[PDB]
Amino acid sequence: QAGDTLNDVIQDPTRRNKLINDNNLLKGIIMGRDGPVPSSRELIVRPDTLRAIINNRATIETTTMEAEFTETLMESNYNSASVKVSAPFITANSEYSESSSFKNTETEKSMYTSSRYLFPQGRIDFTTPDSGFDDVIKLSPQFTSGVQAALAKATGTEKREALQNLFQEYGHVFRTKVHIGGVLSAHTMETFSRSENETEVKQDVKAGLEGAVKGWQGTITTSQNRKLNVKYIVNVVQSEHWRVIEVTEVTAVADLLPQPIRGQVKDLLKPLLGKWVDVEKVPGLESLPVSVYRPKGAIPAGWFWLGDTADASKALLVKPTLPARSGRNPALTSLHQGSGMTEQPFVDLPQYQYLSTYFGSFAHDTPPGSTLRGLRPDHVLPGRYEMHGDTISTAVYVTRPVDVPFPEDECFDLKSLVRVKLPGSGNPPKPRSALKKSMVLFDSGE
Amino acid sequence: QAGDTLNDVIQDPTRRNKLINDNNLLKGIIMGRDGPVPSSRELIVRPDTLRAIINNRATIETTTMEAEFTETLMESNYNSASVKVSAPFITANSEYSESSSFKNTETEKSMYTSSRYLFPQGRIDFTTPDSGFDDVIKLSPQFTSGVQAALAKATGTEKREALQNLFQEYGHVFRTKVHIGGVLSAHTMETFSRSENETEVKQDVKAGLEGAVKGWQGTITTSQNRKLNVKYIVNVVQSEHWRVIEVTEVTAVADLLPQPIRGQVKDLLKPLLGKWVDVEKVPGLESLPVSVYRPKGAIPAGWFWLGDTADASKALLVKPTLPARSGRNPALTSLHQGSGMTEQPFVDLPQYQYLSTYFGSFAHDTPPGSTLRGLRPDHVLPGRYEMHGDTISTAVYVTRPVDVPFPEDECFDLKSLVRVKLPGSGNPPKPRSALKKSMVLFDSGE
Amino acid sequence: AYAQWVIIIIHNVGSQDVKIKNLKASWGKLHADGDKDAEVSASNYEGKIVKPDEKLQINASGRSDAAEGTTGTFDLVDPADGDKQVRHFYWDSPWGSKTNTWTVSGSNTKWMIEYSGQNLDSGALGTITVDTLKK
Amino acid sequence: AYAQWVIIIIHNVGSQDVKIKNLKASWGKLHADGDKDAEVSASNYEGKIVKPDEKLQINASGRSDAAEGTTGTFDLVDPADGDKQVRHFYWDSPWGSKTNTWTVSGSNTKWMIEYSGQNLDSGALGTITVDTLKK
Amino acid sequence: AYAQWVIIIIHNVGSQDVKIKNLKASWGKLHADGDKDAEVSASNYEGKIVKPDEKLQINASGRSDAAEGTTGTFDLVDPADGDKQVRHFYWDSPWGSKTNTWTVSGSNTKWMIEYSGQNLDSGALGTITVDTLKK
């Protein structure tokens, strides 16, 4: 047995099957409220062999992440690409709450750090259908039949509910490249002012955490006298004890389906249905440098708007696709009047955000206030401000999307209006967010 | 077993095959975002024997590198020639970001150092087709068929996409000479002012790192009181545990193909399509010692220019060959107006560079500003300045290529213009780069 | 003398921090709001960060019955730009001369500062609200 | 006296024309470069356009050995929009006081103006360089 | 005396470092910008490196009411060429003599130095901007 490698394990059918079963290589990851836990239902068909490479270099690696809800992924040792792919699901299914230790304000920045002391044995890879090679993985007939049954339902709401249940059961992503071996992991989070040198905070934290993982103390003091709380994970103990130590690539489970069904599933999974409507100029507010526009007429029943905009052409209405249910984050939230000395609204739910400040008096019991809603944190991305006006008392910001080369991250250009100086005191934090284009479905007959 | 050498291992068919499999000698290296990881697909056909030499001299060797994105190669123990061959791919596929600990400004210089305590057993060599000997390595029929299918596609864009996928799957380079045995490696990076004696900084760092690898502490103090962070890698544990400890030579996978197909693949892998167009004199700017020229007329749709030039004959337009996709570095980047007190543009993406300063007011929303682009860091090489003008307020630099004897490193002589003193404050760093000739494809019917 | 007094309300209407520096009362004394007797030290405000939407009060006045007025200086600086100077404020409410003085100098262009409420004819300098914002 | 003097350099660091208007020295006299004896009328500068990327110098000084400083004003105005105001500059280097005055009032969000080199403590008002840029 | 003063703005317009050396105020005192009272030591600038695109301010002026003027010297040197002398600067704003003096000497040929803004007739020496570049 001594000197045995992943090659020998794969060559022996019994040992190969034991490795597959013990590492859950045929199952997707559910990315739920408890984190990336593998499902208990097989997603793909058992392969007759595995693609593997041998690697035995033991060393300490360190990774850093800036996303908010990626703590569990970092604890599971997902590289940057895998964390980026999995972030939407983790955010959507997370448990939001105030008093979150993570801070991402315009003045301070928070980051997660993870150090892995690895004893690798190799890497196992799977062929996705998009690759185009002859050894693609084949989805299980049970999963395919479940998808067909979900898409064969009478109504769009029923189809979406069936798809949600199916994905909650079978997982949201599939690990396509996984490293085998043992690993001792140490994870921490650090918040620091944006003015501080980021390439020195990162270096100090990395040095401290690397020293901590080499020795193996729940608390660490770095060179800069920074106090860090460290969480330790042990995944080391013979080929029978080899376990997955790192995920180098994941592919969304939806992407594994044939194209005609994949398109329908992706469209049906969009949280919001969108619509374009005419706009009307808000009476008054002649002091402000730019005009304020709100949706004209009565909002159609069941639809909501997102806030005041400087665009004089059209306004975007959105409608939830999934009915509100316990244990599921709503796509939108109601807003409530502020506590005192402010007419601005506040998000009912912990970590939701609206795009524009209210230009007037907000009353949630009467229109158009009763139809104003916030957004789930995964629906929005940070934008940029364009300033108008000559004085603080009347200045406004128009929120424009941050141009990106990849269409996947494009955001709607709603030109949300933000008052520079809100009269009174105790106002809500200024919104600087833009809606994601991928979260809205247009032209549907729904 | 005691006293056994690579000769015995190669003589025994079972042990030879075990060595080949455990060391991945038939597979290329993918040179990707995670570093030089071997592929899981066999590139060459299994040889019936191996060429090997025996060497058992254990000693500590040290190497230094000045290239920016070669950290992972140095960690993988690639000598200077292999690092030089592999640098283009690593740079192209790297993850760029600001706050990079590497510094290569005109005032300071950064370098990587690596010390390997080696216990070698020998060296294994492969015959490339270019050598001309009778025992050349034979590319696998699967790889050959993949290349043929990629080149048989209808459109150039599809051909390039297929080639990109094929090379991402099968690797970018192939290790032709590899040392076997065990190795303890210690790696670090050091930044120092260019004024300091380089042959004393190098000696001090080498002494410190060599002392560190002998006794084997994440941090080291050298004789000059330099503080170094050291990363340790263990590759030592019987012929069953021998592993690759150093790569002495690598050959690009494209170079292994027969010449008629190799030419087409090399041409198709060029990121940019080039074109020569007429030029027009910029109005105004009569104070400057030399005339400024910009592309005349409207830029053809889909094409972009690189900046103002002092050449009065022609201007170079470039066009990307691969569509923008997530996880892939674009060949070109858009530019955005500066934050304040400057009309100069800034690169949208972290580590890209443009060749000329803008002589005027840059507005990315209108031409010719909307067609100005930067370059990926692997597209450019440092140039030299030729000064014109008698006073600082009006002086300019004309960027000329650094003459080299090898055509592989030739750069376009675009005569990029750089204003010596940019009015205002908070200007972008002065560009001193020239475009590589090998990165542009001319006269194509595309 | 207490009849000569000044209050300065720094209000960071912007979204990025602004730091106080070089606060120095050449004449008179600083004190806590509502109690000219409760003298306070300049260190109580030196180097303080005014977070966005926060208000910071500086109360100065003449000493106990002395013929002195009050006079002082300070600087608003940007902590996020290497403490680059935003503005320099000089205040003077003399006991002898009737005319007061409130001067704001500096040339930082990525900041907007608006001060209002001062009195310059006679009597105390008054209350001055200084709204600060970073573009 | 000549000890009271000021140099105002207008430096266009942008790419749009800026005009000087309403230049007027209530006290003192405009004069030539490096020559406080060669008086020059305000007409030499009024109505002039400081082209992008070149500097225009205004030299003011008090009467020779007189008990008089130099006080004056000028508007920098954008001609691209019908000669609207960019900013209004007032300078005062008095002979019978220590506090010089250099005020840049007015509002125009389309223009960015920085200035440096002034001295307001005591003595002459110095060489103030004013960088103007239209954005 | 404070009426005699000078400001020196070293602006490294080039792309390579330039070092201050041998800074020495024979008369008067150095001080921090905007406060002639806040005296500063020559060590605060001795041996300082002006990185490219950086600006360094040296403020000198007479002492408190003394009949002395101000006078000083320093050297710009090249850190990358064994501290080879680039230039030697001498400044003198006397209290008795009306004429001032600003002299730049040296023969380093791979450097370009351009100084502007001095006043030599009467009064304070003023503000001098010294743009430095290495060919």
Q: What is the 3-state secondary structure (H, E, C) of chain B?
A: CCCCCHHHHHHCHHHHHHHHHHHCCCCCECCECCECCECCCCCECCCCCCEEEECCCCEEEEEEECCCCCHHHHHCCECHHHHHHHHHHHHHHCCCCCCCCCCCCCCEEEEEEEEEEEEEEEEEECCCHHHCCCCCCCECHHHHHHHHHHHCCCCHHHHHHHHHHHHHHHCCEEEEEEEEEEEEEEEEEEEEECCCCHHHHHHHHHHHHHHHHHCCCCEEECCCCCEEECEEEEECCCHHHCEEEEEEEEEEHHHHCCHHHHHHHHHHCCCEEEEEECEEECCCCCCCCCCCEEECCCCCCCCEECCCECCCCCEEEEEECCCCCCCCCCCCCCEEECCCCCCCEEECCCCCECCCCCCCCCCCCCCCHHHECCECHHHEEECEEEEECCCHHHCEEEEECCCCCCHHHCECCCCEEEECCCCCCCCCCCCCEEEEHHHEECCCCC
Among chain B residues, CA nearest to C81: B426
**d(Cα B398, Cα B388) in Å, to the nearest integer?**
8
**d(Cα A280, Cα B125) in Å, to the nearest integer?**
77
Return the residue in A104, A105, A106, A385 with the most chain C beta carbons within 10 A, the one to mutate for interface testing: A106
Query: How crowded is residue A251: how many other Cβ atoms within 10 Å of its Cβ?
Result: 21
Task: Give the residue carrying structure tokens 């192209």.
Answer: B92
Q: Which residues of D touch E (CB under 8 A)?
A: 1-5, 7, 9, 34, 36, 98, 117, 119-124, 126-129
CA B264-B31-B216 angle, to 5 degrees, is 155
Q: Which residues of A touch B97 (CB under 8 A)?
A: none
**d(Cα B331, Cα E124) in Å, to the nearest integer?**
57
Which DSSP state fits A253? G
Burial-class residue A217 by CB neighbours within 10 Å (0-12, 13-18, 19+): exposed
**d(Cα B246, Cα B252) in Å, to the nearest integer?**
17
Q: Which residues of E touch D123 (CB under 8 A)?
A: 2-5, 61, 123-124
In sequence order, what are the residues at sequence separation of 6 or more whose Cβ sits closer than 8 angstroms to the Cβ of residue B389? Answer: B288, B289, B290, B395, B396, B420
H or E segment to which residue C23 belongs: strand C18-27
- Residue closest to B251 by CA, chosen among B180, B167, B172: B172
Q: Beta strand A416-419 with A396-400: parallel, antiparallel or unpaired?
A: antiparallel
Contact criterion met (CB < 8 Å) for B240 and A7 = no
Query: How crowded is residue B92: how many other Cβ atoms within 10 Å of its Cβ?
Result: 19
Q: For helices A141-151 and A156-170, give the axis angle rounded to 10 degrees.
A: 160
Contact criterion met (CB < 8 Å) for A387 and C16 = no
Q: List the chains bordering chain D where 3 or more Cβ pairs fall under 8 Å.
A: A, B, C, E
Q: Which residues of B touch E53 (CB under 8 A)?
A: 427
Q: Which residues pair with C20 in a beta bridge?
A: C76
First to last CA, chain C: 40
CB pairs < 8 Å spanning A and D: 6
CA E57-E61-E63 angle, to 5 degrees, is 140
Count of alpha carbons within 13 angstroms of residue B319, beta-carbon side: 17
Contact criterion met (CB < 8 Å) for E131 and B392 = yes
Task: Give the residue carrying structure tokens 């004789």.
Answer: B223
- Residue closest to A80 by CA, chosen among A94, A100, A54, A61: A61
**d(Cα B188, Cα A149) in Å, to the nearest integer?**
57
H or E segment to which residue C39 belongs: strand C35-39
Query: How crowded is residue E50: how many other Cβ atoms within 10 Å of its Cβ?
Result: 19
Q: Which residues of A touch D109 (CB under 8 A)?
A: 387, 389-390
In Å, how far is C66's CA from the nearest CA of chain A?
Answer: 39
Taking the CA atoms of chain D, what radius of gyration do you get in angstroms? 14
Tokens of B315: 């201007």
A185: amino acid identity, one letter: S
Q: Which residues of E touch D129 (CB under 8 A)?
A: 117, 129
Burial-class residue A101 by CB neighbours within 10 Å (0-12, 13-18, 19+): exposed
The answer to whether D7 touches D124, Cβ cutoff 8 Å, is no
In sequence order, what are the residues at sequence separation of 6 or more whose Cβ sits closer than 8 angstroms to the Cβ of residue B18? Answer: A7, B240
The answer to whether D2 touches D64, Cβ cutoff 8 Å, is yes
The answer to whether D131 faces chain B, any CB pair under 8 Å, is yes
Residue B327 gets the label, from left (phi > 0), alpha (psi -120 to 50) or beta, of left
Contact criterion met (CB < 8 Å) for D107 and A389 = no
Q: Which residues of B touch A216 (CB under 8 A)?
A: none
What is the b/e burial string over C47-75, where b = at least 16 CB atoms within 10 angstroms of the residue's CB?
ebebebbeebebbbbbbeeeebbbbbbbb
Burial-class residue B278 by CB neighbours within 10 Å (0-12, 13-18, 19+): exposed
**d(Cα B256, Cα B236) in Å, to the nearest integer?**
32
Query: Phi first, then psi: what are they for B80, rounded to 5°?
Result: -60, -45
In sequence order, what are the residues at sequence separation of 6 or more whose Cβ sits closer than 8 angstroms to the Cβ of residue B134? Answer: none
Q: List the chains bordering chain B where 3 or more Cβ pairs fall under 8 Å.
A: A, C, D, E
H or E segment to which residue C71 belongs: strand C70-78
Kindly tell me the number of DSSP H helices and DSSP E strands found in chain C: 0, 11
Question: CA-CA distances (angstroms) from residue B70 to A60, B179, C85?
Answer: 18, 20, 41
Q: In what order do the strands lie in the sheet with C18-27?
A: C49-50, C18-27, C70-78, C84-93, C101-105
The answer to whether D4 touches D68, Cβ cutoff 8 Å, is yes
**d(Cα A74, Cα A86) in Å, to the nearest integer?**
11
In Å, how far is C73's CA from the nearest CA of chain D?
Answer: 13
Q: What's the resolution in A?
A: 3.0
Contact criterion met (CB < 8 Å) for D123 and E5 = yes
Method: cryo-EM
Contact criterion met (CB < 8 Å) for C133 and A392 = yes
CA dihedral (A332, A338, A339, A340) in degrees, to 10, reads: 170
In Å, how far is B101's CA from the nearest CA of chain D?
Answer: 34
**d(Cα C56, Cα C79) in Å, to the nearest integer?**
16
Contact criterion met (CB < 8 Å) for D112 and B340 = yes
Q: Which residues of D touch C105 (CB under 8 A)?
A: 102, 118, 120
Query: How crowded is residue B260: how many other Cβ atoms within 10 Å of its Cβ?
Result: 8
A177: amino acid identity, one letter: K
Q: Beta strand C5-12 with C126-134: parallel, antiparallel or unpaired?
A: parallel
**d(Cα A144, Cα A152) in Å, to the nearest integer?**
12
SS3 assignment, position C73 = strand
Whether omega for the bond prior to residue D52 falls within 30 degrees of 0, making it cis, is no
Q: Which residues of A touch D107 (CB under 8 A)?
A: 390-391
In Å, how far is C73's CA from the nearest CA of chain A?
Answer: 24
Q: Which residues of A touch C51 (CB under 8 A)?
A: 107
Query: Phi first, then psi: what are they for B168, rounded to 5°?
Result: -65, -30
Task: Give the residue carrying structure tokens 């939001």.
Answer: A96
Q: Which residues of B touch D49 (CB under 8 A)?
A: none
Q: List the chains bordering chain E where 3 or more Cβ pairs fall under 8 Å.
A: B, D
Among chain B residues, CA nearest to D115: B424
- Residue closest to B44 by CA, chosen among B178, B170, B148, B133: B170
The answer to whether A120 touches A249, Cβ cutoff 8 Å, is no
Question: CA-CA distances (angstroms) from residue A264 to A159, A164, A440?
Answer: 10, 14, 14
Q: Which residues of D touch B423 (CB under 8 A)?
A: 11, 13, 53, 131
**d(Cα E102, Cα E125) in Å, to the nearest integer?**
8
The answer to whether C109 touches B341, Cβ cutoff 8 Å, is yes
SS3 assignment, position A173 = strand
Tokens of A125: 């890879």
Q: Beta strand B272-277 with B440-441: parallel, antiparallel or unpaired?
A: parallel
Q: Which residues pair with E19 in a beta bridge?
A: E49, E77
In sequence order, what are the residues at sequence separation of 6 or more whose Cβ sits closer than 8 angstroms to the Cβ of residue A11? Answer: none
Q: List the chains bordering chain A where 3 or more Cβ pairs fall under 8 Å.
A: B, C, D
In sequence order, what are the residues at sequence separation of 6 or more whose Cβ sits closer than 8 angstroms to the Cβ of residue A432? Answer: A106, A382, A383, A384, A385, A397, A399, A418
In Å, how far is A391's CA from the nearest CA of chain D?
Answer: 9
The answer to whether B159 touches B150, Cβ cutoff 8 Å, is yes
Query: How crowded is residue A232: how many other Cβ atoms within 10 Å of its Cβ?
Result: 13
**d(Cα B26, Cα B158) in Å, to the nearest integer?**
28
In A158-242, beta strands by DSSP E: 173-193, 219-221, 227-229, 231-235
Among chain C residues, CA nearest to B340: C110
In Å, how far is A98's CA from the nearest CA of chain B?
Answer: 31
Tokens of E27: 């008369």
Burial-class residue B49 by CB neighbours within 10 Å (0-12, 13-18, 19+): exposed
Return the residue in E9, E10, E13, E54 with the most chain B beta carbons within 10 A, the one to mutate for interface testing: E13
Among chain E residues, CA nearest to B390: E112
Q: Beta strand C55-61 with C29-32: parallel, antiparallel or unpaired?
A: antiparallel
Q: Do chains A and E touch (3 or more CB pairs under 8 A)?
A: no
When CB atoms are compared, the residue of A106, A420, A421 closest to C16 is A106
> How far is C-alpha B158 from the chain's CA centre?
25
CA dihedral (E47, E50, E55, E60) in degrees, to 10, reads: 10
CA B343-B344-B345 angle, to 5 degrees, is 120
Taking the CA atoms of chain C, what radius of gyration do you get in angstroms? 14
Taking the CA atoms of chain A, what radius of gyration do you get in angstroms? 25
Taking the CA atoms of chain E, what radius of gyration do you get in angstroms? 14
DSSP assignment of A15-37 equals: HHHHHHHHHTTTS-B--BTTBSP
SS3 assignment, position A315 = strand
Which DSSP state fits A10? H
In Å, how far is B370's CA from the nearest CA of chain C?
Answer: 25
Return the residue in B336, B343, B394, B427 with the most chain D beta carbons within 10 A, the one to mutate for interface testing: B343
**d(Cα B373, Cα B366) in Å, to the nearest integer?**
13
**d(Cα B332, Cα B379) in Å, to the nearest integer?**
10
The answer to whether A12 faces chain B, any CB pair under 8 Å, is no
Tokens of B180: 């076997």
Q: Which residues pair with C61 in a beta bridge?
A: C5, C29
Q: Which residues of B touch E112 (CB under 8 A)?
A: 392
CA dihedral (B76, B81, B82, B87) in degrees, to 10, reads: 100
Count of alpha carbons within 13 angstroms of residue E124, beta-carbon side: 33
- Residue closest to D4 by CA, chosen among D60, D42, D58: D60
Count of alpha carbons within 13 angstroms of residue C102, beta-carbon side: 20
